Amino acid sequence: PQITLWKRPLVTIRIGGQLKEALLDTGADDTVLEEMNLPGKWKPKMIGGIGGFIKVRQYDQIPIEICGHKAIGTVLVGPTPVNIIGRNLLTQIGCTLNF
Amino acid sequence: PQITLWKRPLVTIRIGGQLKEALLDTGADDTVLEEMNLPGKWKPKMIGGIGGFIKVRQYDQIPIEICGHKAIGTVLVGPTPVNIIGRNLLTQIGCTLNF
Numbered sequence: 001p002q003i004t005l006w007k008r009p010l011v012t013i014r015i016g017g018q019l020k021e022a023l024l025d026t027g028a029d030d031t032v033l034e035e036m037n038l039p040g041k042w043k044p045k046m047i048g049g050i051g052g053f054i055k056v057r058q059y060d061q062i063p064i065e066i067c068g069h070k071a072i073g074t075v076l077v078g079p080t081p082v083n084i085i086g087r088n089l090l091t092q093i094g095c096t097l098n099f
Numbered sequence: 100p101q102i103t104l105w106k107r108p109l110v111t112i113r114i115g116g117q118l119k120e121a122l123l124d125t126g127a128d129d130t131v132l133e134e135m136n137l138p139g140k141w142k143p144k145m146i147g148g149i150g151g152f153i154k155v156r157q158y159d160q161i162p163i164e165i166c167g168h169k170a171i172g173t174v175l176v177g178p179t180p181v182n183i184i185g186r187n188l189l190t191q192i193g194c195t196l197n198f
């Protein structure tokens with residue numbers, strides 16, 4: 001598909017029985033999801049943006065479906081106001097910027 | 100061009116006769132540049148981000164050439180972690196996400 005940017009590029013993602021709306025975000029190195037109690041091992045991390053840093057939990061090799069496309073990779077879980085699909089997964093579903 | 104996402108989508112911009120590098124950021128509503136001088140009237144504003152809120156200066160109707168494509172619009176100047184080109188200007192240069 002082609003997604004214009006007149007509005008926020010929100011799409012439906014699936015992570016383990018939770019469907020969520022998330023931003024396809026070319027400005028995000030990593031994927032950052034709203035607080036959720038995922039199973040498995042994790043490591044603490046800090047990530048920074050406008051306003052400063054938040055503390056997140058890094059989970060590896062988590063399967064996630066994005067607009068019906070399969071992906072699997074690292075997801076950061078913490079008190080983000082919005083679910084963010086970063087470049088680590090955007091590449092996996094074949095996403096490019098075009099102009 | 101077509102820009103893939105295995106690396107940060109950084110491009111050269113021209114603004115006020117100066118060249119800068121900026122991040123094409125589909126997850127950003129607004130274009131926000133690091134501290135710099137721009138001519139003309141500005142308004143104090145506050146914007147949000149992943150880590151909280153910051154104070155910025157709002158300059159309206161500013162020309163920027165983004166990777167060879169002309170835009171004229173709102174530029175916010177303040178303590179963003181990196182220069183970001185948001186949807187307000189990405190739309191102007193005809194940028195879409197494609198997968």
Ligand SMILES: COc1ccc(S(=O)(=O)N(CC(C)C)C[C@@H](O)[C@H](Cc2ccccc2)NC(=O)[C@@H]2CN(c3ccc(C(C)=O)cc3)C(=O)O2)cc1
Pocket residue numbers: 025027028029030031032047048049050081082084086122124125126127128129146147148149150180181183
């Ligand atoms: C290492 O991995 C990372 C992934 C993501 C980030 S990030 O989220 O800080 N950030 C990095 C960028 C600033 C260089 C990605 C941006 O696209 C990032 C994604 C995002 C975060 C929080 C809320 C909305 C959108 N966008 C922004 O910072 C701004 C904030 N923002 C926004 C925030 C709040 C509001 C309100 C309250 O009305 C309106 C707009 C917006 O539209 O873009 C940082 C690191």
